[PDB]
Amino acid sequence: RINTVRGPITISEVGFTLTHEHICGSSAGFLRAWPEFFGSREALVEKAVRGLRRARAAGVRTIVDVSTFDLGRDVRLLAEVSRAADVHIVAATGVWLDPPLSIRMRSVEELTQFFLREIQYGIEDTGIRAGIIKVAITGKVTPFQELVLRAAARASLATGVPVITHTAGSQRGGEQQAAIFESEGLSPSRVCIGHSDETDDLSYLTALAARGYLIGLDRIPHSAIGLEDNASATAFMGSRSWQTRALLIKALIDQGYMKQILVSNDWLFGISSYVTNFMDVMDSVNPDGMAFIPLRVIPFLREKGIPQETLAGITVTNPARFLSPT
């Protein structure tokens, strides 16, 4: 069974899953301290519920919200939105790229215990347990990021819960992360190397897939094309089209890797961790939001000749195998 913000669900109940999404990109405590940054908590809930309900109408049954403590994960927000939209949400533990001092001063043993608290006991006082561990690196893994990766591996070996990563920007960091994970004895089948659609290097992707890693092509809608005059947009969403991103799904299917592929939008309903009103720029590129994958990518891949069955395998079977604890 998989833990969600509404409690445990069976695999059969998971259904069509977007495995890399967020309700709100933020910082720890920030939504509680300054909800009016989002116009109000109530407005952000309403936006999230309308968006998830549109995704649900397009067939989405589950999302995995990969926001960690330091991305401002608010598990009560997740719970409210999950229940109102009636879509399963899996919450996350782990450490993203903006740890505060109380996180970044911690040893590997301490970080392991924090992730275990979140998976085993619950998040804060809520009893809501994490279903995935999210980690991130920049460039070359920093000493602190290596501690986070080792703690993630150890928490996953203890609980069976999977790890999702990424490397900041379009740097291809999977091989360095995979080295660390394997040094801890973590099976590749527990690890998704995320934001892998940021690169065209198919040799890099195929080799990771061939080792049994899951490949997150999780950014598909993010494109700054047409937004060339917005330098903040280009830095966040890149210059590659969504079709270019989507064709990596095809390329990996064609190389025999369909079982290793996880697809998502990396969308959200509010963001405070970047420039002000960035959500508006995002919303203007992808008015579909989280429904982008079912509504637009899926038919795109069918049209390129991929079998509905192979698409169902990527969007249903792969996420269930990935999320079910081992």
Ligand X SMILES: CCCCCCP(=O)(O)Oc1ccc2ccccc2c1
Contacting positions for ligand X (CB under 6 A)? 25, 71, 169, 195, 198, 236, 266, 271, 273-274
Minimum distance from CB of 28 to ligand X (Å)? Answer: 13
Residue 301's Cβ-count burial label (10 Å; 0-12, 13-18, 19+) is: buried
The interface partner of residue 78, options being ligand X, Zn ion, its own copies, none and the CB cut-off 5 to 8 Å by kind, is none
Minimum distance from CB of 170 to Zn ion (Å)? Answer: 12
- b/e code 61-86 from CB counts within 10 Å (16+ = b): bbbbbbbbbbbbbbbbbbbbbbeebe
Minimum distance from CB of 25 to its own copies (Å)? Answer: 9
The interface partner of residue 27, options being ligand X, its own copies, Zn ion, none and the CB cut-off 5 to 8 Å by kind, is its own copies
Cα-Cα end-to-end distance for the chain? 10
The interface partner of residue 228, options being its own copies, Zn ion, ligand X, none and the CB cut-off 5 to 8 Å by kind, is none
Label each residue of 109-169 as H, E or C. HHHHHHHHHHHHCCCCCCCCCCCEEEECECCCCCHHHHHHHHHHHHHHHHHCCCEEECECC
- b/e code 195-230 from CB counts within 10 Å (16+ = b): bbbbbeeeebbbebbebebbbbbbbbbbbbeebeee
- For its own copies, the closer CB: 53 or 117: 117
- Of positions 110, 175, 201, 228, contacts its own copies by CB under 8 A: 110
Interacting residues toward Zn ion by CB under 5 A: 166, 266
- For ligand X, the closer CB: 23 or 71: 71
- For Zn ion, the closer CB: 166 or 296: 166
* Cβ pair 75, 29 in contact under 8 A: no
Helix (H) or strand (E) holding 4: strand 2-4
- For ligand X, the closer CB: 89 or 311: 89
- For ligand X, the closer CB: 150 or 245: 245
Of residues 3 through 62, those in contact with its own copies by CB under 8 A are 26-30, 32-34, 36-37
The interface partner of residue 198, options being ligand X, its own copies, Zn ion, none and the CB cut-off 5 to 8 Å by kind, is ligand X
- Identify which of 93, 95, 67 has the alpha carbon closest to the alpha carbon of residue 161: 93
Minimum distance from CB of 72 to its own copies (Å)? Answer: 7
Which residues, 6 or more positions from 19, have their beta carbon under 8 angstroms from its beta carbon? Answer: 63, 64, 164, 192, 216, 218, 262, 263, 264, 319, 322, 323
Per CB under 8 A, the segment of 14-22, 54-62, 66-74, 240-248 that binds its own copies is 66-74
Minimum distance from CB of 266 to ligand X (Å)? Answer: 5
- Tell me which residues touch its own copies (CB under 8 A): 26-30, 32-34, 36-37, 69-70, 72, 98, 100-103, 105-107, 110, 114, 117-118, 123-125, 272-276
